[PDB]
Amino acid sequence: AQNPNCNIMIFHPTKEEFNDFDKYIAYMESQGAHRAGLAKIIPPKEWKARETYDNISEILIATPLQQVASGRAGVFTQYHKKKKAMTVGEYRHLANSKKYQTPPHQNFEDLERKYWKNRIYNSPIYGADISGSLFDENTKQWNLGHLGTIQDLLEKECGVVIEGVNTPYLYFGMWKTTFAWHTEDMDLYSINYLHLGEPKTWYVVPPEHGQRLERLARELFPGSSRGCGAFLRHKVALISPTVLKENGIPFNRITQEAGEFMVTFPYGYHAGFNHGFNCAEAINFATPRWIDYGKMASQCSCGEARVTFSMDAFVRILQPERYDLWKRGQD
Ligand SMILES: O=C(O)CNC(=O)C(=O)O
Ligand SMILES: [Mg+2]
Ligand code: NI
Ligand SMILES: [Zn+2]
């Protein structure tokens, strides 16, 4: 079995290997990459996402979100307070302000220490889930707006034709902006490209150990767990690496820098934080190996998780028994 310790693998495809996206995912899996839940892909030196980022300031962040924490430094939840619209240029100036800017630090490890010590005492503002793309239309390789769609994958594997669409989303971050512990909708893959700016630190639990994380989360968030049998689908709970180690949860960590891709694999729980002003693009995708995870994915039916239109079909076809309860939670 490849990668039996479930380490995060880093790949350096050549320009020729960068042509066929599906093939390369399957290659990474042949080497055991999925066992970690997360892999990094460094593009070939010849590749670029677009020519420059000099002209992005007029993108609108319609609903910036202030991430307000509750709990203790290593075990907390966050809620998202809506703020007034602002442009990417306005958001960048805010991120760089004395109130929000990255503190002085020695290296990524020092910054990570500072994040986990101090995160809860601040409320950073995040631009999330902004439909759109920063890839040039002429970028042919690893262009996250030109991937094969999940609806087409389901039709190819299973024969069923379904409604829905699959487009990318932009994220604008600042110091301490935080992504809570989660798997993807329907335990899909994700891919994330860091277009510009400061790094993103990731934490990940191997898919084969995801239920260990779920059991700790039910212990640490006991009211949330009583409220919903899949409350991590609410994407609000944080647990620090120190707490994970104290509780024997297997995990790994890595820092993504600008110009790098990260792939998350089905049922790979992940969480993390941004180091400073940045812009990322991400989208969910599927492969044939996803189908069995889609069929088994947990679902939130309490009403909290509310998700895209296109997830309807996935539940309807892959999880017909669950469909009525889950759709009630959507309505
Ligand atoms: O940019 C982000 O925070 C969101 N990314 C992830 O949780 C991911 O790509 O799966
Ligand atoms: Mg612009
Ligand atoms: Ni994710
Ligand atoms: Zn729920």
mmCIF file of C-alpha atoms and ligand atoms in Angstrom, residues 224 227-234 299-305, ligand 4:
data_model
loop_
_atom_site.group_PDB
_atom_site.id
_atom_site.type_symbol
_atom_site.label_atom_id
_atom_site.label_comp_id
_atom_site.label_asym_id
_atom_site.label_seq_id
_atom_site.Cartn_x
_atom_site.Cartn_y
_atom_site.Cartn_z
ATOM 1 C CA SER A 224 -23.868 21.251 18.704
ATOM 2 C CA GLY A 227 -28.508 19.615 17.649
ATOM 3 C CA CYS A 228 -27.251 17.884 14.532
ATOM 4 C CA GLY A 229 -25.723 14.481 13.737
ATOM 5 C CA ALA A 230 -23.496 16.160 11.078
ATOM 6 C CA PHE A 231 -22.759 19.471 12.665
ATOM 7 C CA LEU A 232 -19.306 19.784 11.148
ATOM 8 C CA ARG A 233 -21.229 20.474 7.938
ATOM 9 C CA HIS A 234 -22.017 23.863 9.521
ATOM 10 C CA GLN A 299 -25.718 15.009 5.750
ATOM 11 C CA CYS A 300 -26.989 17.947 7.811
ATOM 12 C CA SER A 301 -30.845 18.067 7.835
ATOM 13 C CA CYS A 302 -31.216 20.535 10.808
ATOM 14 C CA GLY A 303 -31.353 23.559 8.530
ATOM 15 C CA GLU A 304 -28.028 25.064 9.365
ATOM 16 C CA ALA A 305 -25.809 23.868 6.482
HETATM 17 ZN ZN ZN B 4 -27.049 20.575 10.921
#
